[PDB]
Amino acid sequence: FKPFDLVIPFAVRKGEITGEVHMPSGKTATPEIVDNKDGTVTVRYAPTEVGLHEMHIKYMGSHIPESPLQFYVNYPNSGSVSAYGPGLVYGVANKTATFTIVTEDGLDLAIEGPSKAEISCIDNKDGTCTVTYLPTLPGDYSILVKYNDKHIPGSPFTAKITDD
């Protein structure tokens, strides 16, 4: 299972940053959270279930603005199409947001939220391509990925764009 790894720009001070991942079964687990003493923290988690997970991050008991987040965990042994990367989950407004589509196996992409974002992918020639978008305004962005008039697993995705 591809690990969840994310840098969030939240500056931890006197309070404790905590987290909770909710799995599709109903099980909860605690992600690993590391304060990079510096304006940020890093959240990591190793999935054991397939599909849509919720990540909650809190500071002093209360959700950060960047929280809750959604992420979709692909089945590894699965051939056929997939997407993954931080731009499906979270980004900062006016910084670049990126994810990967795997196509080692007709691709339709749209990104729609607060501001007009016009995706195009760039083929890595390694059976994957890389989408990068510029969400200029903060909000919730829906990212639609289809392979044959059909949503791939996780599509449409929702990525949360903040600025702090």
Residue numbers in the entry: 1744 to 1848, 1853 to 1911
Give me lines lifted from the publication on this model:
Linking actin to extracellular matrix, Filamins (FLN) can simultaneously bind actin and the cytoplasmic domains of transmembrane receptor integrins. FLNs form a homodimeric structure (dimerization occurs at domain 24), presenting an amino terminal actin-binding domain (ABD), followed by a chain of 24 immunoglobulin (Ig)-like domains. In the 16–21 segment, domains 16–1722 form an interacting globular domain pair, while domains 18–1922 and 20–2123 form intertwined pairs. As an important mechano-regulated protein complex, the actin crosslinking protein FLN has a crucial role in the conversion of mechanical cues into biochemical signals.
